[PDB]
């Protein structure tokens, strides 16, 4: 029906925090996925960009 | 610690008669690996041992 | 509820709910069978009355 692309940049260790239902400072105070979240998660290194 | 014991003689410290604060640890980023297998790490503040 | 967060508490509570629901199923089937036996006994007693 639609697609929301949520784009942002983090450090390498916080990518585990972005799974749905996860907890952590990123997952608690700036960006939290729903518990019943459906969708896909994409993360890729950009130390050269 | 300054220094830790080896695995053959792994050190064991008793903790009793004190007020803990697992939120202080849980907010620290120095923890490369932190996994609780019998309790949620966030819920530790509301559980009494 | 106190120990675990939502995503694993759901896994545990589903198991608990399944167990207690199966217990209820067995209890209500036993009650239905006993009620049928009592219905037969009461009809026989009414005939004797």
Curated annotation (Swiss-Prot), chain B:
Changing residue 28 to F: In strain: Omicron/BA.2, Omicron/BA.2.12.1, Omicron/BA.2.75, Omicron/BA.4, Omicron/BA.5, Omicron/BQ.1.1, Omicron/XBB.1.5, Omicron/EG.5.1. Changing residue 28 to L: In strain: Omicron/BA.1. Changing residue 25 to I: In strain: Omicron/XBB.1.5, Omicron/EG.5.1. Binds to host ACE2. RBD also interacts with the N-linked glycan on 'Asn-90' of ACE2. Cleavage of S generates a polybasic C-terminal sequence on S1 that binds to host Neuropilin-1 (NRP1) and Neuropilin-2 (NRP2) receptors. Interacts with host integrin alpha-5/beta-1 (ITGA5:ITGB1) and with ACE2 in complex with integrin alpha-5/beta-1 (ITGA5:ITGB1). May interact via cytoplasmic c-terminus with M protein. May interact (via N-terminus) with host bilirubin and biliverdin, thereby preventing antibody binding to the SARS-CoV-2 spike NTD via an allosteric mechanism. Attaches the virion to the cell membrane by interacting with host receptor, initiating the infection. The major receptor is host ACE2. When S2/S2' has been cleaved, binding to the receptor triggers direct fusion at the cell membrane. When S2/S2' has not been cleaved, binding to the receptor results in internalization of the virus by endocytosis using host TFRC and GRM2 and leading to fusion of the virion membrane with the host endosomal membrane. Alternatively, may use NRP1/NRP2 and integrin as entry receptors. This is Spike protein S1. The lineage of its organism: Viruses, Riboviria, Orthornavirae, Pisuviricota, Pisoniviricetes. The chain holds residues 344 to 392 of 1273 of the full protein.
From Swiss-Prot, chain C:
This is Spike protein S2'. The chain holds residues 981 to 1029 of 1273 of the full protein. It comes from the Viruses. The lineage of its organism: Viruses, Riboviria, Orthornavirae, Pisuviricota, Pisoniviricetes. Subunit of the fusion protein that is processed upon entry into the host cell. Mediates fusion of the virion and cellular membranes by functioning as a class I viral fusion protein. Contains a viral fusion peptide that is unmasked after S2 cleavage. This cleavage can occur at the cell membrane by host TMPRSS2 or during endocytosis by host CSTL. In either case, this triggers an extensive and irreversible conformational change that leads to fusion of the viral envelope with the cellular cytoplasmic membrane, releasing viral genomic RNA into the host cell cytoplasm.
